[PDB]
Point group: D2
Chain length 152, copies 4
């Protein structure tokens, strides 16, 4: 009954990949990091790593994903291209919490060049720990997102 969390980065965020692994563990003993990012700081293409994590989330191999690039923007765009994925670019505690409470987000995206590591830590912990509210209006809106996916 533990919860798997796939982690991916591109090259700038490779610098903090050990941080990301640690922060997932810090969210609780029930969270198991699955690192899927690169092994060097050599230039790579973020969509490749977004895709790897997003597909795992979509196939339900893991419950959550954590993605980091320079700004988080690339990861959030690429990951959301996978049906079943709800990837939330978060920059603080509030966005991290609300992404779960309102959007039942399954992937958190952060920017290594934009957000300091202790805020990234807080984002990851908050994202993982905060439950989805389950409230009627949110469920309806999430279903509407799914409908958009279905239509394409």
């Amino acid at each position: 009954m533990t919860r798997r969390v796939a982690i991916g980065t591109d090259h700038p965020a490779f610098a903090i990949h050990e941080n990301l692994i640690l922060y997932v563990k810090e969210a609780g003993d029930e969270f198991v990091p699955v690192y899927c990012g690169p092994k060097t700081a050599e230039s790579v293409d973020y969509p490749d790593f977004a895709s790897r994590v997003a597909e795992m989330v979509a196939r339900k191999e893991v419950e959550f994903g954590v993605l980091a690039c320079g700004s988080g923007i690339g990861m959030s765009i690429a990951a959301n291209k996978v049906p079943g994925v709800r990837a939330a670019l978060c920059h603080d505690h509030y966005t991290a919490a609300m992404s779960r409470i309102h959007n039942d987000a399954n992937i958190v995206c952060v920017g290594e060049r934009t957000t300091g590591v202790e805020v990234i830590r807080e984002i990851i912990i908050t994202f993982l720990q905060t439950p989805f509210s389950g409230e009627e209006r949110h469920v309806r809106r999430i279903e509407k997102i799914r409908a958009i996916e279905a239509s394409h």
Copy 2:
């Protein structure tokens, strides 16, 4: 003419006139097309994200501006439309880089999270900042297209 479709849900309705103004402030060539709600009544963000995103995807407008409480819902829903690159921005840097690196065509903002003067800065910066056209960025954007195609 560079058309900019604008969508909100209910919390961001109170600033929909702001959004129209900020788009215009980016330059005379930027033409706001308001596609959001007509009243303050509660609505569902994906409906308005979808409207704007489809317009961008269809090439009916060049850009979209989406606002909800946090910006998160707008960014998720809009990105579900093939051809859309929706960037949730919270400052000048993210606004600029979404264009320079990601060639983003939709900017998403949170009315409950980001103060209006920063939202103003975000919108203006997003609209005014060109895509770099750099080899690596073009390659990565095409990879995003490939993800869409694979699904």
Copy 3:
């Protein structure tokens, strides 16, 4: 009873009732003491920073909340009062750390920069989060006091 003096200038007057509410939301023991403008007309932030800062310095209230356009003016002016440790916060993390590390007694926020729900989070976090009391932080806080004394 833990009293919290509140001050704003004109851009933040629009949310002064929010600020009062957010203080109360932190807990029944938190009592807001509104010391800001009674109207929306232009005022000078240092006048209201001074009023609240002096109350904190005097030990008349435990805490202060100051809001201006960016929070910057409030943070500069309030810190000019000996005994005041005014922290410009823009998120939950800065709100918490201002208390844990700096034992801050005034929180400053920007109405034009930070969305109201984040301002809410900042105020609640600031008031609820205790000072760590750690040796190194105490020492550093004392060095701030010494800077005041040397002037």
Copy 4:
């Protein structure tokens, strides 16, 4: 006719002290970084380094100061304790620009643990490049801060 910019940090921000020096230079050839922070990653007390930079600014030895700690908060508080200093904790381009335009700030404070380095870069460049507006209401308000100092 060049413009001297004193730079101080405590220990968490020492890792980016070379960054800070570079970012000041990037603001323009007219800006001269004057590094005054620690020489090592050894734990230090931020008020000591805030004071050194703030005193340089107050005595007019330099025009501007750049201060970095974990959150920027400690630097902001300590530097503002020196009369003649207007130290602005900035977290983005907007606060960086407005601290100059409105507050004629002479010290910019940033958090190494909160703000990513490319945003710190933008903050420093924006802070240094953006002039004070000189507008009547701002001058009056700045004078009122000076009055507060004088009264103590």
